[PDB]
Amino acid sequence: SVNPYIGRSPLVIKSYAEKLEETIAYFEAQGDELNAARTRTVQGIPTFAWISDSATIDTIQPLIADAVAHQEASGEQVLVQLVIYNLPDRDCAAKASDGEFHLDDDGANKYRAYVDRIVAELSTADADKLHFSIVLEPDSLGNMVTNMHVPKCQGAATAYKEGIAYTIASLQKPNIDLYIDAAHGGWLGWNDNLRPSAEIFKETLDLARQITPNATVRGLAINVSNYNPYKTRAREDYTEWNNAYDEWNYVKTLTPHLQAVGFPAQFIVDQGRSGREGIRTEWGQWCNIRNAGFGIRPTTDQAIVDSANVDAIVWVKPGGESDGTSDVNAVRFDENCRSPASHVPAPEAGEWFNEFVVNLVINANPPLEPTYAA
Numbered sequence: 001s002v003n004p005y006i007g008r009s010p011l012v013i014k015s016y017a018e019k020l021e022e023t024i025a026y027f028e029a030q031g032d033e034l035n036a037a038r039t040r041t042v043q044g045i046p047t048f049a050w051i052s053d054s055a056t057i058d059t060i061q062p063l064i065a066d067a068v069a070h071q072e073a074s075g076e077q078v079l080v081q082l083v084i085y086n087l088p089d090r091d092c093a094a095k096a097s098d099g100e101f102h103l104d105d106d107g108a109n110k111y112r113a114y115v116d117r118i119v120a121e122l123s124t125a126d127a128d129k130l131h132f133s134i135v136l137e138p139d140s141l142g143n144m145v146t147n148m149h150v151p152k153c154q155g156a157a158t159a160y161k162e163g164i165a166y167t168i169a170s171l172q173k174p175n176i177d178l179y180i181d182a183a184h185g186g187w188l189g190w191n192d193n194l195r196p197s198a199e200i201f202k203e204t205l206d207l208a209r210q211i212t213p214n215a216t217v218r219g220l221a222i223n224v225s226n227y228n229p230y231k232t233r234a235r236e237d238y239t240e241w242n243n244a245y246d247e248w249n250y251v252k253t254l255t256p257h258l259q260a261v262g263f264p265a266q267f268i269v270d271q272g273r274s275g276r277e278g279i280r281t282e283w284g285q286w287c288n289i290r291n292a293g294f295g296i297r298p299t300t301d302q303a304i305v306d307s308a309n310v311d312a313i314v315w316v317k318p319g320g321e322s323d324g325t326s327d328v329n330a331v332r333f334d335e336n337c338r339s340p341a342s343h344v345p346a347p348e349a350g351e352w353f354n355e356f357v358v359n360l361v362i363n364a365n366p367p368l369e370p371t372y373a374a
């Protein structure tokens with residue numbers, strides 16, 4: 001197994017880049033050409049494409065066709081980055097989940113068929129020309145470590161392991177690298193959470209190997225949709241007694257446990273919203289955190305990454321797509337989205353939050369280099 005990111009060009013998601021035209025127009029109207037140009041830079045930064053429901057499977061083949069055309073035109077080794085996010089009884093510790101599959105409505109079998117539909121799209125002649133990096137199931141297995149007092153999590157534990165195992169077993173190809181989601185330092189980095197986390201990742205991989213005999217994964221994805229810095233400048237008070245107080249330290253502290261159980265210790269790390277620290281009063285604040293900045297841009301450069309266990313810094317959650325609505329009356333209202341640290345008003349989850357992106361640009365660290373036309 002080799003670092004699939006080296007020499008590869010992660011795919012710019014066209015549908016995401018187009019959304020940033022609104023942000024460019026805002027800055028232009030402010031007479032702010034530097035930030036308009038920084039936003040153009042952001043348009044050229046690769047992000048992950050999320051497959052968070054069955055309908056979104058329809059976007060995969062057009063994405064692939066575009067990717068192949070780009071590979072032909074550019075001569076790059078295109079690396080398509082995807083998130084698979086649709087377990088049955090998804091998000092078991094949340095008051096509400098938008099996940100479309102439910103265990104009491106044939107959800108386990110429906111999830112397998114959803115995976116099978118993804119497999120078909122990733123098995124075309126065009127798909128074979130590309131390489132894929134796929135994050136498996138954010139907000140899943142950490143619940144088995146810390147949320148087993150929750151009835152829905154108790155009832156979903158076996159299904160989460162079996163579901164992810166099927167996804168792993170179904171996506172063994174030379175041109176696909178898989179990263180199991182492993183939450184973030186503030187969730188699983190606490191001393192007593194490290195070993196059970198490593199064990200559950202290994203347990204899930206072992207289940208996968210009972211389906212497809214020599215099945216492997218590349219490793220883990222961390223900080224997905226969160227804000228934790230890679231290397232903290234000013235270590236925050238809420239991290240007290242947690243040795244995973246930034247994501248680089250999460251890697252360093254989790255790695256020995258992975259090694260002990262025989263699970264691959266290679267990581268990709270989301271930094272898309274990690275540029276600004278001191279934006280939260282509690283580690284568990286996650287929804288549209290105000291003044292978040294774009295973080296370290298996607299890179300494999302070891303001068304920045306500074307760990308043999310880290311394949312790449314990546315941008316998984318696409319900045320500007322809302323984490324949830326702030327409207328108390330909304331059918332999908334989540335009270336976390338009115339936390340004292342949240343940016344309000346915020347639109348429905350997934351909808352474009354332009355004011356938030358304006359701030360992501362302004363608060364980026366390192367500052368964004370502008371892209372000016374020739």
Ligand SMILES: OC[C@H]1O[C@@H](O[C@H]2[C@H](O)[C@@H](O)[C@H](O)O[C@@H]2CO)[C@H](O)[C@@H](O)[C@@H]1O
Pocket residue numbers: 093094139147184186187224225226283284285286
């Ligand atoms: O990390 C983003 C993810 O967080 C979920 O809440 C976590 C939280 O991140 C962690 O700090 C705390 O210890 O545990 C909770 C889960 O119990 C949140 O529920 C998700 O919506 C969000 O995507």
Ligand SMILES: OC[C@H]1O[C@@H](O)[C@H](O)[C@@H](O)[C@@H]1O
Pocket residue numbers: 050052098317318321322349350
């Ligand atoms: O913004 C990226 C993704 O975030 C997830 O938390 C949401 O459930 C998806 O609807 C969205 O596509």
Ligand SMILES: [Mg+2]
Pocket residue numbers: 097098099100
């Ligand atoms: Mg529903």
Ligand SMILES: [Mg+2]
Pocket residue numbers: 352
């Ligand atoms: Mg709008």
